[PDB]
Each structure stands twice: as C-alpha cells, then as structure tokens.
Design an enzyme around this catalytic site. Structure first.
Site, PDB file in Angstrom:
ATOM      1  CD  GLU A  11      -3.042  -0.870  -0.146  1.00  0.00           C
ATOM      2  OE1 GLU A  11      -2.903   0.156  -0.848  1.00  0.00           O
ATOM      3  OE2 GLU A  11      -3.865  -1.788  -0.402  1.00  0.00           O
TER       4      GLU A  11
ATOM      5  CG  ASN B  37      -8.473   5.878  -4.914  1.00  0.00           C
ATOM      6  OD1 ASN B  37      -8.905   6.128  -3.790  1.00  0.00           O
ATOM      7  ND2 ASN B  37      -7.380   5.152  -5.085  1.00  0.00           N
TER       8      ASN B  37
ATOM      9  CG  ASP C  91     -13.436   6.901  -6.540  1.00  0.00           C
ATOM     10  OD1 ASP C  91     -12.387   7.463  -6.169  1.00  0.00           O
ATOM     11  OD2 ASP C  91     -14.164   6.251  -5.783  1.00  0.00           O
TER      12      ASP C  91
ATOM     13  CB  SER D  17     -11.969   8.570  -3.165  1.00  0.00           C
ATOM     14  OG  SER D  17     -11.432   7.413  -3.792  1.00  0.00           O
TER      15      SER D  17
ATOM     16  CG  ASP E 112      -6.591   4.753  -1.577  1.00  0.00           C
ATOM     17  OD1 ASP E 112      -7.804   5.040  -1.404  1.00  0.00           O
ATOM     18  OD2 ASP E 112      -6.204   3.773  -2.247  1.00  0.00           O
TER      19      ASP E 112
ATOM     20  CG  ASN F 239     -11.015   5.194  -1.042  1.00  0.00           C
ATOM     21  OD1 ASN F 239     -11.114   6.399  -1.227  1.00  0.00           O
ATOM     22  ND2 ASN F 239     -11.307   4.307  -1.983  1.00  0.00           N
TER      23      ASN F 239
END
Ligand code: NA
Length: 129
Positions: A35, A46, A48, A50, A52, A59
């Site tokens: 990660e 992301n 979309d 969003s 992280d 998220n």
C-alpha cells in the site's frame, strides 16, 4: 515517517492489530509494504476522485474526510490528514473498522493481489516481537 519492517510490526502489535479479525501480523505488514512502502505520508488519488491516505492507504470514499470527495462518508470520523501521522494509532483504529466491514482484508486490493495466500510470516521474520 518511513518505518522499518520490524519497527512497523512492533507498532501494529502494540496497537492490537496482530491477529485482529484473525489476520496475523505478517498480513498487516505485507499490506502496509504494498500500500505505502511503510511511508505514513503516502497519498494516492483514485480514478473516482477519492484519495487513499497513510501506511494502509485508507480511502476518503468511506473512512475519512478530506473535504474533496463528493458523495463520500467519514465512517472512521477523522480528517484523512490524521492518517499521515508518524503515530499509526488513527490508521490502526480506522483499519480495525475497515477489516470488520464484512470482506476482511479483501478491502485492500493490494493485500488480495500480493499478500493473500502467500508466506506472510516472512514479513515479521527475525523481528523481536
Ligand atoms: Na469522505
């Protein structure tokens, strides 16, 4: 902060992540490696819209508030910036809620793709725990 492997293992254990929801410490360290590369300040956008955040790439779509993720929730009730701290308390507390959500660690796609089923104990190998 960039944690060492065994340093993060010790931090995660102290905050009660080892065998949380039946996930051995090696699973949590492996997920952190892929990660964030153990970097508490890691942020990634992301597709979309969003973001992280942190050692476990939590998220903004569901878990923290960053004020720029339209139609999103803040189910850990924290600012996403709290998840970039040198102290992993907030990331661990929130990760406990994520892994309890029903799909276990499959919530971390990099856990599913790179850790799940592998020899995760290698990640805590030689650590004084
Ligand atoms: Na959000």
């Amino acid at each position: 902060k960039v944690f060492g492997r065994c340093e993060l293992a010790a931090a995660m254990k102290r905050h009660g992540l080892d065998n949380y929801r039946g996930y051995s410490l090696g699973n949590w360290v492996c997920a952190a490696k892929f990660e964030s590369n153990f970097n508490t300040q890691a942020t990634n956008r992301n597709t979309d819209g969003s973001t992280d955040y942190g050692i476990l790439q939590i998220n903004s779509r569901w878990w923290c508030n960053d004020g720029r993720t339209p139609g999103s929730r803040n189910l850990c009730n924290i600012p996403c910036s709290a998840l970039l701290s040198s102290d992993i308390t907030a990331s661990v507390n929130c990760a406990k809620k994520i892994v309890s959500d029903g799909n276990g660690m499959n919530a971390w796609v990099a856990w599913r793709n790179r850790c799940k089923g592998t020899d995760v104990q290698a990640w805590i190998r030689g650590c004084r725990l």
